[PDB]
Amino acid sequence: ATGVALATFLQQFNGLAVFTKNTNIKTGIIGTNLRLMLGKIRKWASDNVGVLFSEF
């Protein structure tokens, strides 16, 4: 269940721009970078504590 849920969640990142040499994103562009993705993954993981995970 965790695997399917996570796979569904990550789907929304498909096709999203990315910048790594210089993390500034220009105004109005649709994109992200490594730090933001890490943060959002952490948020999602924290949400599901207690239903599928024991508190990390």
Partner: protein, 133 residues
């Protein structure tokens, strides 16, 4: 650079309650020098006598002034839409919010906007080397 203060990125991902449309993450830029503010701890302490306090449930909020994106209806920045936001400061900190809801919106003049968002919980990512979970 733990010795400089400033904002480095702002992202937003709208959702429309009634119709269910989604607009992917979009950058944004601030209208003036004011920075956002946060309040993460969800509990509120009220004072009593002799150092006792009344611990009670409460929301975690954020305040976020942003220059409007010329492609999104103004109404969406106010109470008509559901919001998810992120902020990345220079020193590496990242603040993430989801399922926010705007409250008691104040009038905007079409280009500068202030949003008062509340959510069940706000998550903070520290730079490398934290001393606590």
């Amino acid at each position: 650079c733990n010795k400089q203060n400033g904002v480095k990125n702002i992202l937003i991902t709208f959702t429309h309650c009634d119709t269910g449309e989604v607009i992917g993450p979009i950058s944004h830029e601030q209208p003036d020098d004011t920075l956002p503010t946060y309040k993460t701890c969800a509990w509120t302490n009220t004072a009593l006598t002799n150092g006792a306090v009344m611990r009670s449930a409460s929301n975690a909020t954020m305040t976020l002034p942003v220059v409007r994106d010329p492609r999104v209806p103004l109404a969406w920045y106010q109470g008509c839409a559901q919001i998810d936001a992120q902020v990345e400061k220079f020193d590496g900190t990242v603040m993430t919010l989801t399922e926010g809801a705007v409250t008691e919106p104040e009038e905007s003049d079409g280009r500068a906007v202030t949003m008062t968002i509340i959510a069940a919980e706000i998550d903070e990512l520290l730079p490398p080397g934290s001393l606590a979970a």
